Amino acid sequence: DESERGMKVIESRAQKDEEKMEIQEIQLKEAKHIAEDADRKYEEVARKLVIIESD
Amino acid sequence: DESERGMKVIESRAQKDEEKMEIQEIQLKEAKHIAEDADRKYEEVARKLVIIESD
Amino acid sequence: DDIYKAAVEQLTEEQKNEFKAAFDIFVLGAEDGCISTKELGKVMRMLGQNPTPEELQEMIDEVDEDGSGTVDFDEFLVMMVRCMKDDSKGKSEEELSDLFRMFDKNADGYIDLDELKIMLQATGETITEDDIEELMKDGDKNNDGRIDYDEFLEFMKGVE
């Protein structure tokens, strides 16, 4: 019962940590996708910078 | 044993999820900082595109 | 920034001690003792708010003075005063226009260094050369050495 309560707290913690890591993971994926998108945009603008510099 | 093993499995899981939480959170801050940097480098090059384009 | 920094200077020691206890909650477990978007997001969610990663990064950028990407305690005190207003409304443009005319002694449309110095001495506070030079650099955004009407409105934004 006590180990089960221990478990409930740490299971709730695992759930909070699980939800938070999923949130942070999804947010990481998006922050990273934003970064990747921003890096893609960097490259779109970097190659267009070259086009623009060439222009 | 099942509630204690459970507690230990959960503590292990909670720890895996807690580490993933902190790992994804620390890495989120970094992914966000990469997005800031990715957007930052984007802006530096995009701004050059605008400056070069303005010229 | 300046209006918030002044409010921080005026906080009592007990008020700062309570803010430090709150800060300690935010940075519990952080590698550098500072608040990153991971600690800020965990507390905002604990408080019932659901900010996006972009909103969290902006909340940090608004007070980050070093460019650390994190919030230290000094930066935290600015975040906490920014989150509250004693100086609600903050007057408006028509009132600042009439005050501008009072700084512009020669009626040219600009506040020059001599005008600023006369007005600062009139306040009764000890004025050092550094007080004069720093306020004029903070006001004159186009580097002419004078504050125009639009610079004056930015200069006095939020000043009660």
The 3-state secondary structure of C115-149, one letter per residue? HHHHHHHCCCCCCCHHHHHHHHHHHCCCCCCCECH
Query: How far, in Å, CA of C114 to CA of C136, rounded?
Result: 11
Chain CA centroid to CA B17, Å: 15
- Please check whether residue C136 is in contact with residue C116, taking contact to mean a CB–CB distance below 8 angstroms: yes
Who's near B12: CB < 8 A, 6+ residues apart?
none
With an 8 Å Cβ cutoff, is A47 touching chain B? no
Residues of C in contact with B29 (CB under 8 A): 36-38, 69
Technique that determined the structure: cryo-EM
* CB-CB neighbours of C148 under 10 Å: 17
Question: Considering only CA atoms, which of C94, C141, C148 is closest in space to residue C116?
Answer: C148
Residue with tokens 């309570």: C18
Query: How far, in Å, CA of C44 to CA of C68, rounded?
Result: 20
Among the partner residues B29, B35, B36, nearest to C38 by beta-carbon distance: B29
Q: Is B15 exposed, middle or buried (0-12, 13-18, 19+ CB in 10 A)?
A: middle
Structure tokens at A12: 């709730």
Plot region of C48 (φ>0 → left; ψ -120 to 50 → alpha; else → beta): left
Chain CA centroid to CA C156, Å: 11
Can you say which residues of C are annotated as belonging to the binding site for Ca(2+)? Answer: 64, 66, 68, 70, 75, 104, 106, 108, 110, 115, 140, 142, 144, 146, 151
- Amino acid code (one letter) for C71: V
- Please check whether residue C17 is in contact with residue C73, taking contact to mean a CB–CB distance below 8 angstroms: no
Chain C residue with CA closest to B18: the answer is: C29
Residues of A in contact with B18 (CB under 8 A): 13-14, 17, 21
Chain A residue with CA closest to C52: the answer is: A27
- Amino acid code (one letter) for A31: A
Mutate: best of C31, C36, C38, C40, partner B, most B CBs <10 A: C38
Residues of B in contact with A36 (CB under 8 A): 38
